[PDB]
Symmetry: C3
Amino acid sequence: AKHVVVIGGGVGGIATAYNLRNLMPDLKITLISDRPYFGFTPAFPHLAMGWRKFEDISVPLAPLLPKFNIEFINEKAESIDPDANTVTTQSGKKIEYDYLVIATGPKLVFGAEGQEENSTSICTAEHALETQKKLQELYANPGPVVIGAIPGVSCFGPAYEFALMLHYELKKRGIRYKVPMTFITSEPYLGHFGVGGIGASKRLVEDLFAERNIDWIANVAVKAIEPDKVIYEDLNGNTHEVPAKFTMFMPSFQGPEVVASAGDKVANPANKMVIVNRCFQNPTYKNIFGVGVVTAIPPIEKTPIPTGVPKTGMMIEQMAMAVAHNIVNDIRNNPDKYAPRLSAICIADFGEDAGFFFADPVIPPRERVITKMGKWAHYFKTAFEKYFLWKVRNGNIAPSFEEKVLEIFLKVHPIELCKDCEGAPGSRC
Amino acid sequence: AKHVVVIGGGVGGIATAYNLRNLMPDLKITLISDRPYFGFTPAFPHLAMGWRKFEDISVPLAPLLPKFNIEFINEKAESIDPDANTVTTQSGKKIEYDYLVIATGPKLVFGAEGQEENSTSICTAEHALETQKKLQELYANPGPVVIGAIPGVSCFGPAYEFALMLHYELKKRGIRYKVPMTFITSEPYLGHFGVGGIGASKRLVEDLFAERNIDWIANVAVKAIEPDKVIYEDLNGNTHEVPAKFTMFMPSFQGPEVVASAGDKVANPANKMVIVNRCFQNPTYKNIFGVGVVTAIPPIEKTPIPTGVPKTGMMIEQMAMAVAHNIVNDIRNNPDKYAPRLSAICIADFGEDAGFFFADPVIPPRERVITKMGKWAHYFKTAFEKYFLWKVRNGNIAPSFEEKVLEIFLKVHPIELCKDCEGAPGSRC
Amino acid sequence: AKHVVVIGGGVGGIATAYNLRNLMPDLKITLISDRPYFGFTPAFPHLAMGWRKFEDISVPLAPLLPKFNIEFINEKAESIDPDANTVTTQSGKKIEYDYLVIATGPKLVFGAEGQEENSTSICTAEHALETQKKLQELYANPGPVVIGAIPGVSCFGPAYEFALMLHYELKKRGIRYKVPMTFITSEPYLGHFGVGGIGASKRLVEDLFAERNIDWIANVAVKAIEPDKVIYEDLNGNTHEVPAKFTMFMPSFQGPEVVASAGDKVANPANKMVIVNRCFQNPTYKNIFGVGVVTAIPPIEKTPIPTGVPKTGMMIEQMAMAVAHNIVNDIRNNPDKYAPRLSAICIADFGEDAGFFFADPVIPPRERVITKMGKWAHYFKTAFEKYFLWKVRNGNIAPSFEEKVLEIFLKVHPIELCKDCEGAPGSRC
Ligand SMILES: Cc1cc2nc3c(=O)[nH]c(=O)nc-3n(C[C@H](O)[C@H](O)[C@H](O)COP(=O)(O)OP(=O)(O)OC[C@H]3O[C@@H](n4cnc5c(N)ncnc54)[C@H](O)[C@@H]3O)c2cc1CS
Ligand SMILES: Cc1cc2nc3c(=O)[nH]c(=O)nc-3n(C[C@H](O)[C@H](O)[C@H](O)COP(=O)(O)OP(=O)(O)OC[C@H]3O[C@@H](n4cnc5c(N)ncnc54)[C@H](O)[C@@H]3O)c2cc1CS
Ligand SMILES: Cc1cc2nc3c(=O)[nH]c(=O)nc-3n(C[C@H](O)[C@H](O)[C@H](O)COP(=O)(O)OP(=O)(O)OC[C@H]3O[C@@H](n4cnc5c(N)ncnc54)[C@H](O)[C@@H]3O)c2cc1CS
Ligand SMILES: CCCCCCCCCCCCO[C@@H]1O[C@H](CO)[C@@H](O[C@H]2O[C@H](CO)[C@@H](O)[C@H](O)[C@H]2O)[C@H](O)[C@H]1O
Ligand SMILES: CCCCCCCCCCCCO[C@@H]1O[C@H](CO)[C@@H](O[C@H]2O[C@H](CO)[C@@H](O)[C@H](O)[C@H]2O)[C@H](O)[C@H]1O
Ligand SMILES: CCCCCCCCCCCCO[C@@H]1O[C@H](CO)[C@@H](O[C@H]2O[C@H](CO)[C@@H](O)[C@H](O)[C@H]2O)[C@H](O)[C@H]1O
């Protein structure tokens, strides 16, 4: 039987591994990850707020994967030799492969001066639990809060989420009137999201921030985060400072060193992310595939302050479907190749209500969008959390009824037959 | 009996002639037009989209007009000698008049370099049909679309209609995701219309364009249209390019050579349109009147990129009522004279829904506005098309019941008794 | 028997005296005011429009105050001696105090050239009644109207009310299509109000002005008001003019000479307003307190054209409660001290409909806001008019049920226990 190695035990890796296992019972699958657990990333802001226990939004992998006949190597992957078809781990183990799926997620860059030491973040479970400790210090003696995104950021949604959630928590403890709140972004306007807006999302986010007294500055570059202030710069080259006792900023993403260790035909020279085509396949090494945030996708828009394109859960699940069909078809000498649609349903949780965004596809021109807001969306978010964690524990990330439901309600088709893969990911075949 | 000559068989000419015939059965009336049909201009964008047949939106004049005792001459009117009270047609035929109504409509100016050769337009039935043929090539080989208005345009609505109708068509064909759309206009902002806006039209159109993925650039001057790009200049004097496979631009308007031949007391030197007062009568030759787009009306505001005032269907019908009454009162020695109210009910059809704009009067200060959008407004537009074509065929463009219904629903009165005609058209007596 | 003197028979003065009386029946209380009446300021725009009679919105104080054991002296206070605990009136009466409350309202500055002589205002009942006279001149001979605020203004609401009420009047008279209207403000944008906005107030007023054809110019400095034009200067320092037969502008505010007569420890050396701390107490003379418009509160933000913070009715009522309690506790050897919450409910009346604005606190960061518009709000303003006048005539500006009702509907509490008064008014202890 053939052998697939998957690097990374997160959303993209588990989904590709499970898709492969369900398509092909006797295929060999080995997953390598530095963390012994799968963590449900959409719940990290909630964890930082103290609204979750770590144990409730994570799944230990060692006792779980052998039930679905998948081998788990709890180690970090160190280098890739693509001519030799090998991955080497931190202890020195060499695993040979027929196909490689790289799904290592973000490598975080705290690009602002003093960001790593003076600020907080919520991108990992470990960073989130440390943010929670800083919040208890805030509640005890309130002060100015500033949240947002530095230049180069491509994941803007959790910043908006955390701000609105923190507003809600401060308000429930009756202390919001003692805490200034300011939001600062590299986005040219609020609700850009690195996608050029989704419908009238600019008007909607502006209205929401006004109603909930969150001040904002957009189309600027955050340059320094000090223990007592945040410094940013505008398009004229003028510098400005804003007071701050507690901060939470999004880092920007680059590719990891394990990817860089491969050629310049695999690691993008500008950012170290995986070079992929429409079919999420490396153009030069055809048995290497990219899934998730680690993939190199061109910006939708060249903004005055540089921003990038998000890779959301629904996009990543479509990547995982396409890639898994592409590997299985290659094994069987079926010439049909699939591109993911790259549409997205995103919910931004605000506390007891939430924003609902749908874009089809995410990269314009679009066939359609939906932008709505209500309490119903918050309960749908909590419900999807419980469903997705069930899916991880039961060994199927893509049950048939789910695709049918998204087709009934939203006219979504997750993957398309692609006649020519050669082009940037997101371009149409 | 007395003799009135009407030049032009369109909205303004038919309405004045019919108004005159019903006011005075004994009056001799001659209508001169270069086209053998009346064409319903508001259905031209729909003709361009292939949603109408020409025969369904036009009425032949020669077998019809004699039934209402109106003499039809199917020739171009070539010159006017206002001192001899004579009109001279292209074949040399000389027709003496007691009163003259000029209603020749717009003379089209394709002012951007290469516009007439490389672009399309929808202002005449013949141009609309040419546009339909070019759209066929766009559906077969999809590319970037740019639509809009060059400098000096005074009719913006049909450009907004066309853009939204095309978006609808592309979605019904399931190929909108393959076609970038950009809107480029001389207006200082979207929803200006050459009237400084109608209520919150700017916010309405901005939200509509964002919801339906129509990109836009306002407050610029389109300089050139090539086979492959559109070239515009900004207010800093810097030039830009946008890629373009299919384009549709509005031309600007001037007046005709028949008006120019009457001298500078009748022809406005700056634009060749008919010099008229408040009563739509010529100041120096008082047996000459102007009705419709050919009348010289000042812009409502001086915009950074030059723009002019629309003459809409409701405004022109009001011009026709006022003019017919003024002539008939002269014959009878009744010193009463009338100015049109110049209010407008406009519907921009977007395919399956539409925007409804009401302004009373169009030229500020206004008494009231209404700006709405829904499915209902689309069905009203179709309904009115049928109604207006019926009126042309049945010899009465102003049935009494219509004025009464407009009074009880929107509080409009079509004409006002004017104490002093001596002033610009649109200014208050 | 302890003795407190109150200067000013307005909102702040009446409210502080009544609070003190109800807290301590055996306290000696003297109120000094130059006007013999209480004037319900919120109905001055209505008075200027001719929609009220002066007698319906005022309360003579001489026969009223004795009823609640309050000594009334109808004289202007001219000097204060803080070291001697004395107040000197215009005649020459020296009044000794144990505690002093300064509440003399706004002292008006007509900063624009020709403003006092050529424009109109509505800040006093005298000015309001004179404005009504000029409005009759306008109806007789229609012409261009301009309304707004000059640099330094801190009270913007009444100018917005007046513009819309006047539009409404003209509409009922059927002459609005003959009257251009322009609103010119020192605010950086419409709906700033000197508070940095209340929810989406900017969007609301912008749409309102569009629907009702009121033109506007923001972020500029009105320099001159002439009999036929209004002159302003923009941020680039360029001069402009606008035609005008009728105008109404807000003047800016400073402190009175009676405050200046005390030390530069009492009078703010920039604007002459009363120097207070968080508990609305003077830092150096601890038996001196300030209430209402006369208190010196820093601007919420420094705007391009200078602008200041309003003191609305509800804000002033809470200042009065805190000050009354702070005096009583000092007498009773109770160390506890109180700061006002400074929340506000403001209704801007437009004629037949109105805008409802709620901000808690007015000075940010805020716990919550509400912005609404409808017919109900107009009837609400009329209802509060009747209710407040009743309270003045009945000796209790703070009946216990009102607090409970504000609590159950808006979650408002009027005052807070303050562990440290030492800081700027409106800052958090
Ligand atoms: C904070 C946060 C919130 C968040 N919320 C989202 C949401 O509400 N909806 C939504 O659609 N998307 C949200 N996203 C984005 C996205 O869904 C997440 O970023 C995903 O987690 C990304 O999926 P990936 O598979 O790309 O990354 P991963 O982090 O889940 O997993 C990577 C795994 O790889 C391991 N690893 C790293 N390096 C390794 C090496 N060298 N060797 C072996 N293994 C390696 C790593 O441990 C992990 O298991 C949201 C996104 C965010 C984040 S800022
Ligand atoms: C494309 C387009 C759409 C459009 N839609 C409108 C709408 O939805 N509502 C509305 O209220 N108005 C709309 N208008 C504008 C306006 O109503 C039309 O332009 C009217 O047709 C203008 O009426 P006129 O009477 O001014 O002109 P006409 O074109 O109808 O007819 C003039 C006649 O005169 C003839 N003629 C020209 N030169 C002659 C000489 N030398 N001798 C004799 N006769 C001559 C000509 O053939 C014609 O019969 C909309 C407007 C548009 C347009 S871009
Ligand atoms: C035109 C206008 C409308 C207006 N509308 C308001 C509204 O709808 N809601 C709201 O909440 N607030 C509104 N305000 C603001 C505010 O509530 C008013 O300005 C109050 O009237 C202010 O209260 P104050 O106590 O600060 O001032 P006052 O004018 O009521 O009373 C001052 C009294 O003192 C007398 N006086 C002056 N100088 C004296 C000396 N030297 N010695 C003795 N007495 C002196 C004076 O005669 C008066 O009795 C609105 C505000 C406006 C106005 S621009
Ligand atoms: C496992 C697969 C999951 C598939 C999920 C499919 C997603 C499709 C949902 C998007 C469609 C729009 O979603 C729908 O929008 C309307 C608004 O028009 C929402 O809102 C409506 O319901 C709530 C009920 O409390 C009302 O208060 C609200 O006034 C009303 O407008 C619906 O509650 C929501 O369900
Ligand atoms: C020849 C004579 C010409 C007659 C003149 C015609 C007068 C024009 C009247 C326009 C006034 C607005 O017209 C009216 O607006 C309301 C909006 O509140 C619309 O109401 C619409 O919006 C609501 C929004 O909740 C929808 O749920 C509803 O299905 C829809 O009907 C009416 O469908 C429309 O008829
Ligand atoms: C004794 C002191 C007085 C205590 C102060 C009372 C607190 C006031 C609370 C106001 C905040 C709630 O604001 C509430 O919003 C809704 C939403 O449109 C308003 O409007 C609603 O009622 C009106 C009543 O005719 C309807 O015409 C309208 O269509 C409906 O929407 C309510 O009239 C208003 O009461």
